[PDB]
Amino acid sequence: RSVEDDKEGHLVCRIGDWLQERYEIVGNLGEGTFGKVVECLDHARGKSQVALKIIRNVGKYREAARLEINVLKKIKEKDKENKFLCVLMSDWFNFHGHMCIAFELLGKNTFEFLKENNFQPYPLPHVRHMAYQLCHALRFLHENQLTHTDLKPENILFVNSEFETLYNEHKSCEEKSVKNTSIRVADFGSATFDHEHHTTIVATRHYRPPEVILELGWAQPCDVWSIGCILFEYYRGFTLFQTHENREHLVMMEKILGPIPSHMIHRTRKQKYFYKGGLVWDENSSDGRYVKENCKPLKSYMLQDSLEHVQLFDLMRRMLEFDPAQRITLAEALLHPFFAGLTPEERSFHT
């Protein structure tokens, strides 16, 4: 058996193949621009289930996965008992140029689940539990001088994504409801410690905070903004900022959240976004008309009036504060009355 790569550097993988004289491939899980995710049995560890992330054999991806491995090591040192809901590695190796990182086997990521539910949103109790877990996991990294920088639904995975199929009460359709809402945070390859180099731009655009857009520098509050975005997405089933471009995104922020504080406008070197101290944009352009038609004040997106919905929206708005210094921290978020709704099993992490 020659090892074969396709034209983009992906490993050609077959069921039955072994790697490191140990990992037997038994299924497919995923593929992205990074490589593939395959399900293996680990024959050195009693045929335990493994998700093996196999990185393209392309220098820059190999360099990034090396950075990811080094981060994952540091994270494990700080959480040896694996209590803080992070997806840590059990092993790593260079398989003929392909970096491979072995992880626990999980269910569907939270985007894929929403998508296979035809974008019907998670119910509030699931959203609440998921919020709590995310605040917990990330508070732990924040207190250990780490920022994730790339939180998004697809990097958050259910431990088990099995679901009940129910008839939607108020629509003429079926709905998939996850049976257990325990989640884990993955993909630490861009995670950055306080003392390490901070690139000008971080985050996937839809989850990217205004301080990064305005090139004001960033730290842990970046993750809080992303969390606010993710929670909106879970609750409504569509993205908060369905945007492709900076000026448009800022306009959306203004329409949904209110004016950008003038102290941030005064400090940014990105003055091309502003004119007479206000955002400058073409209301008659395609993006202009799109934003004017579609972006409404945040509170308008509430599905019900009841206390738990109001509390969710209070918390999201605090996570979506423009000023990163004023934005809610996750330690504070975990004291929010929204979380009074959690069952004792959810609150004590016995799910």
Ligand SMILES: CN1CCCN(C)C(=O)COc2cc(ccc2OCC(=O)NC2CCCC2)Nc2ncnc3[nH]cc(c23)C1
């Ligand atoms: C390695 N893994 C982070 C990888 C990087 N990352 C965050 C993603 O890629 C997100 O999207 C997926 C991740 C997994 C599987 C499928 C995904 O997408 C669907 C897709 O590709 N469909 C493909 C379409 C064609 C067929 C499959 N990941 C996991 N799945 C199961 N257990 C796991 N343990 C740890 C991980 C993991 C973390």
